[PDB]
């Protein structure tokens, strides 16, 4: 499946420090395009990518109205969650939600998502059928019963199969120069002696988009999974990502090691040596 759209909401209570903060961000693939922050001087859904800027006043006002209503609903859900977990009004808690759609090359729905967490733990999730729910505990089962009774899954399904995919397709067209462009990694290997007996080989991937990438070191053709230090893929700040993979190698054995790089922007996987 070739593209995704996702919305992420975070609602954070802070007793004694006002009403719970609500932050929303939207992404197409690994590109953020909107944000909303209830703490901002003047909260609105605001652009974060150039290709969304062309949307008219009706779009922005509608998205802002939705975010404000959502902030209010999540403030109520934070109060409900207290009751469901027998918790006091004195503590700080967080609800998170992620939802959206994946589409294949032909733009048809590949799959839909809608998942909730409470205090960083799974709470309830819409199943892949877009029709039933998986509740993580007895509290979430209470919500599940309410949502079954009210046919909430059908509402999500209608959005995910309809508006979600239609708007994703629109954004992909409006942002075709960037959203439909993969930037392959610029790769190299660096060598850092640590002693007379050992050296680090570090395989670098820089300037790539999207973030998904595989970096693997082989010794004599065998993957060194257990012995490779891999850093988390990290943003450069210019839309692209960086990653490295390192192995500690006996001095004089450097040529027995090969770094292998797979990425969507490459015609074929790369093999590097120092």
């Amino acid at each position: 499946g070739s593209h995704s759209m996702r919305y992420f909401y975070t609602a954070m209570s802070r007793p004694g420090r006002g009403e719970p903060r609500f932050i929303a961000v939207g992404y197409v693939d690994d590109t953020q395009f909107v944000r909303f922050d209830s703490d901002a001087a003047s909260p609105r859904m605001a652009p974060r990518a150039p290709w969304i800027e062309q949307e008219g006043p009706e779009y922005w006002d509608g998205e802002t109205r939705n975010m404000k209503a959502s902030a209010q609903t999540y403030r109520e859900n934070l109060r409900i969650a207290l009751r469901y977990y027998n918790q006091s009004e004195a503590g700080s808690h967080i609800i998170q939600v992620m939802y959206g759609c994946d589409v294949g090359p032909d733009g048809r729905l590949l799959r839909g998502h809608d998942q909730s967490a409470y205090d960083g733990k799974d709470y309830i999730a819409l199943n892949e059928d877009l029709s039933s729910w998986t509740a993580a505990d007895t509290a979430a089962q209470i919500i599940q019963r309410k949502w079954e009774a009210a046919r909430v899954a059908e509402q999500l399904r209608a959005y995910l199969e309809g508006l979600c995919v239609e708007w994703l397709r629109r954004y992909l067209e409006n942002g075709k120069e960037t959203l439909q462009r993969a930037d392959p990694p610029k790769t190299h290997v660096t060598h850092h002696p640590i002693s007379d007996h050992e050296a680090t080989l570090r395989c670098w991937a820089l300037g790539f988009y999207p973030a998904e990438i595989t970096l693997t070191w082989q010794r004599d053709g065998e993957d060194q999974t257990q012995d490779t230090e891999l850093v988390e893929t990290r943003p450069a700040g210019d839309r692209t990502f960086q990653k490295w993979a390192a192995v500690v190698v006996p001095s004089g054995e450097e040529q027995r090691y090969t770094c292998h790089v797979q990425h969507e922007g490459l015609p074929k996987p790369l093999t590097l040596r120092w």
Binding site: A24, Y59, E63, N66, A69, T73, N77, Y99, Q155, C164
Partner: peptide, 11 residues
């Protein structure tokens, strides 16, 4: 475009 149900689901 964000999901915008008539009634936003409550826990």
């Amino acid at each position: 475009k964000a999901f915008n149900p008539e009634i936003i689901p409550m826990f």
